[PDB]
Curated annotation (Swiss-Prot):
Gene behind this protein: EAPA
Protein's recorded name: Endothiapepsin
The protein's enzyme class: hydrolase
Family that this chain belongs to: Belongs to the peptidase A1 family.
Source organism (scientific name): Cryphonectria parasitica
Portion of the full-length sequence here: 90 to 419 of 419
EC number, UniProt record: 3.4.23.22
Amino acid sequence: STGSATTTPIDSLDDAYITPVQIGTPAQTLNLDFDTGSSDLWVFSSETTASEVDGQTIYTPSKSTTAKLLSGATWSISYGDGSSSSGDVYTDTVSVGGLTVTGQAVESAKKVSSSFTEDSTIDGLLGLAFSTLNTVSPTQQKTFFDNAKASLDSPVFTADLGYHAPGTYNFGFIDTTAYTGSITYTAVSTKQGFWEWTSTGYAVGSGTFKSTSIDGIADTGTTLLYLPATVVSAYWAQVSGAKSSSSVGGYVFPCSATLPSFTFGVGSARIVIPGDYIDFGPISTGSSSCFGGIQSSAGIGINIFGDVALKAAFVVFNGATTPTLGFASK
Ligand SMILES: C#CCN(C)Cc1nc(C2(O)CCNCC2)cs1
């Protein structure tokens, strides 16, 4: 089997991407944030605290003839931004772009933190990291990808995120028309449950390439590119007036600036992030200070190749017995 679904930015900044997901019988379509940095499929639901729902579409298991309560199973998760959610668990039929998994654990939120309530466009998350990170207790549950793997034509999914434009998640096949050149595959460590890999270095703008190992995770659920402070300082030093602002919480730059590109290494290959992809717009409406898309990872403990990096590439999440990551230019 295969599946293919379009993913769409939630706003003009590409803060996150939503993909329609069919849950239950008859189908209830929710727009979920596909997150390769976590491993829970959770949704706003009829059980979510009413004061914590503000415009989201909810999953109602009582209206699904295929829903079954997963008795005694609960879940509780926290993300890098301090957001959180928790609730009960059902199993139900879940379809993405024509690919159907029966008996998928669908984690129904009883509580969500404020950042989820405030984002009326995201109805939940669909985790695509390794199932060892799934938070369901006492019986840990498999991700949608893990459950689908045996049925897929090939045990892979691909992320082709757009720049201020829709893109595509494909399951079970590699669309050889979607990228230029070849896909360079690189080793993955699953020891922390992430799609964790090692970039071979970087360049800023037209500068020469600096060969250096940068361990990090491929995370479609993180907006920005978080890299070591040395690398990030070398990037922003090329932008007149750029500086790290403790009040804003990161590097800012004059909105009048045109930004240099940023290149990261994948083996001997190179992915070039155009400078415009690094511009996240005014810090507040009307401000002439703009927020940078490359930020320091020093406070988080891990480097994150988030959407800023991944949207410059066609990215293969290869879930073969020895998982690997592939990157192609596009
Ligand atoms: C701060 C800090 C330390 N870590 C929690 C930082 C991290 N946060 C994550 C994510 O939550 C980011 C969003 N997508 C899912 C994974 C992975 S590592």
